[model samples]
Target: ATFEIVNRCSYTVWAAASKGDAALDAGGRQLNSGESWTINVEPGTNGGKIWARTDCYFDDSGSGICKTGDCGGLLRCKRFGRPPTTLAEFSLNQYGKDYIDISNIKGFNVPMDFSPTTRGCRGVRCAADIVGQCPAKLKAPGGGCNDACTVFQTSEYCCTTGKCGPTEYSRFFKRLCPDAFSYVLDKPTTVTCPGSSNYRVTFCPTA
Candidate 1:
């Protein structure tokens, strides 16, 4: 039961136990602020598509991108109608410079690529590092991305910080781009900045 999901917006997701039921273990918690989702499925007797909606809002306005909350992801059905079978499956696609497959019950740090692959994420610098004072950098600090302007925890790859590069543009960088990218004025402009749930500092480029 391989599932193909699409994040129809520019935000992240929050998965809670389906119905908020603790016993179901079917909770909704968001991971990366990505635009898609995939599940290694069990070889099912029947195949179907599953959906999970975005945690953000949506707008009725005619626009290519979403304007309000996360109108991007599909509303997931919490737990699958039935759990999948072969937990050994893997993604046939790719993300960033990383070509990740299944964990196959193996612990982390185990590489199992069955294809001729090369991930491009060799030396990309992090916004937190560039900011020099993120304090909450990810475990694999250098060369990783977060979904949005967040506190910098797990699932640390997407499009966080809203600040990257090293230039005056970084000054104009808006701290948190896209969703929380808007700004209202004044020094230390905290009031009008969206996603103000963040801090700031300068960035540190990789050599």
Candidate 2:
């Protein structure tokens, strides 16, 4: 399967991807507005994650920090990125199905669309103005909206244990992006498609 990452934001974004122990596209790629990067997924690839890093400055050897989604300050990430970053996740060719989702569980930075290019499967997007609408307590310093779990660190928000339900913060995100995962235990966001389908993940997607 092919996963194309496109940047439609007005600013530059560094696209990053990780699958199992390997880093796709050398972990990250700089994408100016209208630029894109693509990744080929081998069959049975699981636990795949893709995201964008904003407001970054990498030196000659690809070392820099991003205001959002910094992955250990490396141009090529060796780990999952920091919080307050939107995520596009995939599990390909599992039982003849491909599972995909856009998640804001870590929080929201940029708008995103995770859609299948092949197959008739429906797409999912989260293009709401989450930063602007972010509650004061859940807002991050630089930009983006922090998930309540990241801010408060309570079981009520994090769902670490016990019974968990939607809170005001989760509702805020859910109301904005119904198709994206708003909480840890959230359902109805993960979609499935044919195993052979290709996909596109767009940043700052427009209607």
Candidate 3:
């Protein structure tokens, strides 16, 4: 989900909540008065005001990116300090949502990264969201779906055995999946090294 507001308040001020791993390409920690940004959401980090930036500007220099007065070429201008490319191709799904403003565009496609939720505390988290199987606001633990991970199997975490995973979300996974985080399954399941995940979760000091 993406939100954009005018700095007409003499200089807008805002707070953000985000799963750093879910931030979009060329996505970063800063957004100026007229700048926009893209967001890539993960499972647990689904909702929150973790990210915030003020000021936003679009294609003012006519670089084929960043428009000032109006912005509808976001798929063209992926980020700030960057130029547009004709080689870029993009797509969006049904349950999947795309977020954009004058700055950058963000999107979500669940089920592309299923992990098998029945595994419990130790099992993998099904990429339910990738295929649009589960809602970001789901309260049911582990979640349920109709794939290889659909039913419990022996030797596999009750969730892992039958997990076939979703089909659609993974198609464009490479383009939309932030290099930092996977779409539905999330960072915890795929990344393990101190350099693999979050600076706080993987690198933060734990006495």
Candidate 4:
């Protein structure tokens, strides 16, 4: 799989790769406004995750912090980042197709789009500016917003059981970004595409 990671926000965005073979510049680094980077991902890659960090501060050794989406304070991430991130999650070549989704279940730090470069596949994304209009109770202390499960930590919000369904809180997110996984058990948000297609994960895509 090939990914074109584009930073279209007015400010700089620190992009992170939690899992991969380092095929696509797989390191913790900053992408300036209007900048983009390309990465070739291996199919069936373990724990494939991509996200952007905001308001970060790091030293020359690539150790410090970010207001949101810090991956153990390291410039390079070997694991998932902190909560409130717009995550591009993928399981490539699963049953001959790729399962892809943008998850707001962890909450959203920024707007994101996961689009197929190939014509046969349909694109999906969560590009809502939820941070600015997030509910007060679900808002993260720093920037970004928190999902109900992160805040309430209940079975209702989390939908730990397969039987459980969307709550009022989950609906709030769904109303804004219908294409994203708004709750833990949300199945409709998930989409499958031909694994042969290339994708572009864009940060701060215009409405």
List the candidates' TM-scores in order. 0.20, 0.96, 0.21, 0.91
For model 4, the superposed segments whose C-alpha errors exceed 4 Å read: 20-25
lDDT of each: 0.22, 0.90, 0.23, 0.82
TM-score of 4: 0.91
lDDT tens digits, residues 1-207, model 3? 122211211232121223222323223333333333334333223222222222333344432222121122232222222111000111122134221111011222111111112222121111223324333332123221212111222223222344433234222332333432222333322321111122111000112
Give the candidate number with the greatest TM-score.
2
- For 10-127, candidate 1 gives per-residue lDDT tens digits of 3453321122111112222333443333333332111121222222332343122211111222222333212100011222222211221121111111111111112322211112
Better of 1 and 4 by TM-score: 4
**Superior by TM-score: candidate 3 or candidate 4:** 4
For model 4 the local lDDT of residue 48 reads: 80
The residue-by-residue lDDT of candidate 2 on 75-108, one tens digit each, is 8876788889999999998898999999999999
**In model 1, what is the error at residue 171, expressed in angstroms?**
48
Worst-scoring 10-residue span by lDDT in model 3: 82-91
Candidate 1's displacement at residue 89, Å, is 19
State the weakest 10-residue window (summed lDDT) of model 1.
104-113
Clashes of 4: 1
Q: Give the TM-score of candidate 3.
A: 0.21
